[PDB]
């Protein structure tokens, strides 16, 4: 059940009117396109007002995530990220990708930086290309993360290739989020 | 879940009101029909106003994509193409098919030029028709891409027959896209 | 996703207001019922104005398509056919069945004249009636095609009994379509 | 997909407003109920105007068809029947059961008189009851068909017991339908 | 397809507005609840105008039908019953349960008095409770039928325990229905 | 599990050496052919020694049963029948078919004479033949039963068309079995 | 896995060579036929030596157990019963059916007297036949157990109608078994 | 379960040792291959000794049956046929194909001469080959049956195209079988 | 059921002792492996004695059948082919591949020369290699057929590319088989 | 069906006695284990005699093939490889890995050098490890193949990374196989 | 297919006769029990001769492998371990668990030290028991590895918790195996 608010909206539609986007499922291609569209709609509505992207996702397709990421940068509006419950892999990468000074996590949010295989080599059958591609895309993901966190590249490259859990406080200290929001 | 904006639309229907079409999945015949109708509808509304076609597609049915392609050329309105996430096979072909100087890619989009089997011989069961037909369709697709990329036929013929990924930058250097859009 | 235009419509219904019928799937009884009702409705609205039937279909049930064909003739309004993507079997038949001077194909449509088995003998168990009936319906379709294409009966009968692919230009020469439309 | 005209109807409901009932599938209990209700509704709307019943059906359950048959006779208004595409078994029986002088068929329609088993013996497990019942129902259908067509009983009985296809012209000669409608 | 009349009703709701209830399926607890809810509504709108309950049902759950039975008696308004197609078991029982002088059948309706097992013992695992109960309920059904038909209990008890089909005429002589309606 | 006796036999094979045939499942076509073969093998082995056919079967295919019946008569050896647990429909008919004076039942054997539909009309699609055939085969089954039991034909015809349970004692009194075997 | 002793038997066959029958599953028709066949065979080898039947069964079909029950009485050899793990419903009925003085249970055996529903009315569709038959079969089971246990009928009729568990010692005091075996 | 006689054979293998082949199921290609091999094997053993082929088959694949038929004629040994239970379509055709004066039926065997569709056009997808081929196969089967029954082609052509049952006696009068075997 | 001859054999193994190989199903890799091993084994037993290959097959995988074909030539012994029932595609190819003067068909075998798609391009994704390869293997099979039949290359290429049914007599004329065998 | 020679072997086991190993399916872990064991067995039987490895495989798991490859080298005896029908990927790699001067192929065999993904990165989820591993395994296969064929590394690397079919003759020229065997 | 050597063994049983055990699949409890049973047998036949355990396993259940581990130590005979193809997790753990000086790997074997989760907490629903246990068992596995490899516990504890592939050479240097065998 998803309730229907009359001003007739569904609950998410009503939140969208207040510029809130809920990313609360695994990031596949249908999810990406729904996020992208919402970011396109909001920026056309009012490109001055901030946008609030709440993230609760175990991750998903790397190209689908990169599409959300690129649209976050494309839009004129500052995109604020709030991690809740769990932000793992592409979810945690999207959290870190929020506008500077505006990346948040609720006190008890699980955060995993590890980005696993995920099938980044699309439909490639040849070994030479498929292996080498996923290293390139691995490499330019580690670079965007080094920049956003201020961690040396090599630390990032090491940390995203191992299972590692973080509390909201450790994530703040790491540079993945700017602050922990408890209230307001 | 697809949110429902009220001015009641779904999120894509609202984006259609801003002349934006979202091609975000495999190109089967349902998809092709939906797109073609969106293009036809948009052209009827305002023939002098550009159409923005966002591509995030792993590819799909060759004749289906060809229906979209022909309709892109059929309509009077210029059809801009913006590649995000992934544009492969028929995805990448429709991307190159965008209006002159109006094909774009976001900074991290993956582009694959490779166009595979695809079931191009419909319901044919005879060897000398089917095999000859799939060479004939391959050749005429090479020819169109050579025209649209500026590349010699030989180069397209070699490149579309193998798995290779391109950055948005390499896509620009190739003649595939006109520019990388980063902001605004 | 089928987008929902407001002037409450879906995309095909909005096209229907402009006298456009989208036949974009395998022809079965549901499809046949749908198209017929669309043709019946449009003719009742304005018998003087033409109807535009876009075809993208691999074919299907012969009796279902024949219901369409008969209704295309029953209506007072001229029925233009625009083949796109693929027009095979019954699809290619209904394309040719369009009004004189008003049968078109987009430049890269694949056209198959071949009409295979299908199941024209409904639920008949007796060999004598079933086999004779499919020859009778074969002959009676070959005749309608010969009249519409101008081709001699013996040629049509030779060409519809085998797997055969035609380009839009070849189909114009043969008399399947009147013209290839590229623009407007 | 069923399109939605705005005067907010679906296509069939719009045709229902012009007193057209579309029967386009196997006659089961759901379909029968739908058709009976549509007839009941139209008769109560205006009992003096004709009802048009288009028939494209492979047939089905005998008591279901017999419910539609009874209602056709029950209502005050003349029920005109148009056979299109295929009318077999129950479909053809209902086509013949249309108002005197007002039973038609499109030129390429297939008609099958053959009326098979059809599960007429409901839930009976006793041999002597089920077998004698199905012979009794089989007898009273032949009788009804003799009266409608003007063919001798022994002629009908011979034809309802064998697979056999009729063209629209043969059906006219037989007495199943009054005329072929080609235009208007 | 359930067509949607605009006065914006579905076809059965439009009929419901003219005090007509269509019981045209196997009687389970969902159907029971819907019919009961329809009778309750109709009586509360107008207790003085008659209700028309159309029966085309193979029967079903005994306690479900008995809920319909009791509500038919509970409501102030006279419930007329019209049997079409098939009224078997609980279908035939509800038909006879109609208001005195107001029980009808269309000329070709199949009536089956036979009331078989039907799981009347709910989920009683005990043998001596389950068996004695179905005897008790069978007894009280026979008793209710005997009174509505004017038949002796012993004849009803004999006829309810065997497979026999009745025509509309036989059912009238028996006392199941009051008249056979052909027209109007 | 079916145990394996060394003299290596399976338990039934070992019983077959002592001229015992177990018919202990529903009579389908694979079962019939297994029974028939066993009766053919035993009679070839020694046509003087009696055969013991133990029957525990809910019935099955009528033509399959008739094949067993015919082979029981074909063979030279007297075929003794012993009903145990349950002998219903074709099982009870096979029990009655045992050699005169040599049809038995164990004290607590359930016996049902009722022979229901069972699909005796093979693959017939036409009503006239299929109904009339199953009455013929009904009739010549009642005749064989009248003879074997010594009951008047009409009593048999009435009793085999209703659900009716019998104890071994009632079956003896009826003439279905010659005696009840308790011991030895 | 069922191991294969050589002297080449599976483990059960090797036990059968020492006159031991293991009934260790639900009592359906396959199992019943197997137990019946093992008893017949063992009585054939040596009718004077005793048979040991170990029982671990939740229950199963009544007629199937009745088959085993009758065969136990039919054979000349004494059938000793031993209850291990669980003897419920038909399993417990068979346990009591063992030879006088020779009914046993291991110390920790669960014994459930409750004899439930278990579809004792085969496939009878008539209410009054099916209900009265199951009461008849229920009564003749109570009678048999009253005879085997020494309990008055009224005690058995009440006990076999409710769930209760008995320890080995309680079963002995009740008269279900003759002794608890512990050693040797 | 298939019993295992020791002299180790299965029951059919032992019957093969007495030159008896059991055709007791639908004639698919596995069955046809098995039979053909049995005939080939038997002919190799003793060319001068008759082969007894028991038929109990609803029919099946036409080319499969034709393989058995040709092999029956191929072998030097006379192949007697004995129809039991049911011989329909390809079953009844193989029955008539038995050696001169050596085709038999048991007193209660059901014979159906009707030979239906059967998928005689293998893997053909073209209309004018498949339809013509199935008439050609129908004609040559009629011709063989006319030869084997002594009936005029016209009579066979009429009779095999409709559902009719025959008693073993009617089969004898028709020329289908040489005699009814009742005893020995 | 596959019968188990004793001289421990199964029927095909017994035939194998007489140098008979049964190819009776669709040709896949398992079948191909089986036949090859059978041919390899027989040639090692006695290279001087001929091998008899019976064919009843709808065809299958081209590379699998080609393994058979190559092994038919590799062996020292002459390989006779006897087509029965159906020999289509690869089946009809391996038939023609038999030793000179030693290729036969039974009088009523259906023979199809048509070799359709199959999947000759294994697991190739590239169109250029896949389409060219199937033409190369088509040509190379047309050549082998032309050599074996004596027919001119251009005729074979025309006839193997279309659906075509041949009788045993037509196949003899064409040069597919050397003779039709009726007896012995 | 796998036939059973009596010297009691199945067909493959009889060929195993003449030192022939048949590899005729996709190389998974079960198949690898079977082949390794067969090699281990033959080497221990007689290390001085050659082993014949027939290869008809689409390929499969890389570590599985690499186990067979290692064992081929591990054993003392020369392992001769014969390619028949199809040898692709792992199949072709194992064909080339046969004893120097003793790698063959039948004349119509298809060989594919292309070695795709194949799940070489086992159960690794870390990106950098899985990608670099598959490049390392890909490198050491190319190296092995360069040494066996005598082709330059850069030539092998080009061919193992693309779809490509070779005839037996081309494989000889390439260095994959030493000779084509046609006869003997 | 598992070939069946006659000295009548299956291939693995023949190898078992030469003291060879093939562990070539995922280690679950069935495989555990089989390997254990094989070690127990071999030690009881001859305690003085060595046992050869071949490992090609992705690993599996921890408590299953540990059963194999303990039995390897329990038996008197030295257990040599030969790693081929893939020895991962519990596969690699068993490989190192081999007898001192007697642990080998074939040149191209993939070794993965990584021991992941593997459900080591059975069915413990409690959090503090399940988590503390897997830590405890992980600790004692690391301890056993440290002793067998001569590596410091801290290095083993670090390497067992990460995805890393080792070649045969690396594994030798590490102390996992004693030597790489190429031949003999």
Curated annotation (Swiss-Prot), chains A, B, C, D, E, F, G, H, I, J, K:
The active site is at 89 (nucleophile), 114. InterPro entries: ClpP (IPR001907), ClpP/crotonase-like_dom_sf (IPR029045), ClpP/TepA (IPR023562), ClpP_His_AS (IPR033135), ClpP_Ser_AS (IPR018215). GO terms for molecular function: ATP-dependent peptidase activity; ATPase binding; serine-type endopeptidase activity. One of its GO terms (cellular component) is endopeptidase Clp complex. One of its GO terms (biological process) is protein quality control for misfolded or incompletely synthesized proteins. Its EC number is 3.4.21.92. It is found in: Cytoplasm. The keyword Protease applies. It catalyses: Hydrolysis of proteins to small peptides in the presence of ATP and magnesium. alpha-casein is the usual test substrate. In the absence of ATP, only oligopeptides shorter than five residues are hydrolyzed (such as succinyl-Leu-Tyr-|-NHMec, and Leu-Tyr-Leu-|-Tyr-Trp, in which cleavage of the -Tyr-|-Leu- and -Tyr-|-Trp bonds also occurs). Keywords: Cytoplasm, Hydrolase, Protease, Serine protease. It holds the Pfam family CLP_protease. CDD domains: S14_ClpP_2. Belongs to the peptidase S14 family. HAMAP family: ClpP. PANTHER family: ATP-DEPENDENT CLP PROTEASE PROTEOLYTIC SUBUNIT. Cleaves peptides in various proteins in a process that requires ATP hydrolysis. Has a chymotrypsin-like activity. Plays a major role in the degradation of misfolded proteins. Fourteen ClpP subunits assemble into 2 heptameric rings which stack back to back to give a disk-like structure with a central cavity, resembling the structure of eukaryotic proteasomes. This is ATP-dependent Clp protease proteolytic subunit. The gene is clpP.
């Amino acid at each position: 059940l998803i309730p229907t608010v009359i001003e007739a909206y569904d609950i998410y539609s009503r939140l969208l009117k207040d510029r809130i986007i809920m990313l609360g499922s695994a990031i596949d291609d249908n999810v990406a396109n729904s996020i992208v569209s919402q970011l396109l709609f909001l920026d056309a509505q009012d490109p001055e007002k901030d946008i609030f992207l709440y993230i609760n996702s175990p991750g998903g397709s790397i190209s689908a995530g990169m599409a959300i990421y690129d649209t976050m940068n494309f839009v004129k509006a500052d995109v604020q990220t709030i991690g809740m419950g769990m932000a793992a892999s592409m979810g945690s990468f999207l959290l870190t990708a929020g506008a500077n000074g505006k990346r948040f996590a609720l006190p008890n949010a699980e955060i995993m930086i590890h980005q696993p295989l995920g099938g980044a080599q699309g439909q490639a059958t040849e070994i030479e290309i498929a292996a080498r591609h996923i290293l390139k895309i691995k490499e330019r993901m580690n670079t965007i993360m080094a920049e956003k966190t201020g961690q040396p590249y090599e630390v990032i490259a090491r940390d995203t290739d191992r299972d590692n859990f973080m509390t909201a406080q450790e994530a703040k200290d790491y540079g993945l989020i700017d602050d922990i929001i408890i209230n307001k």
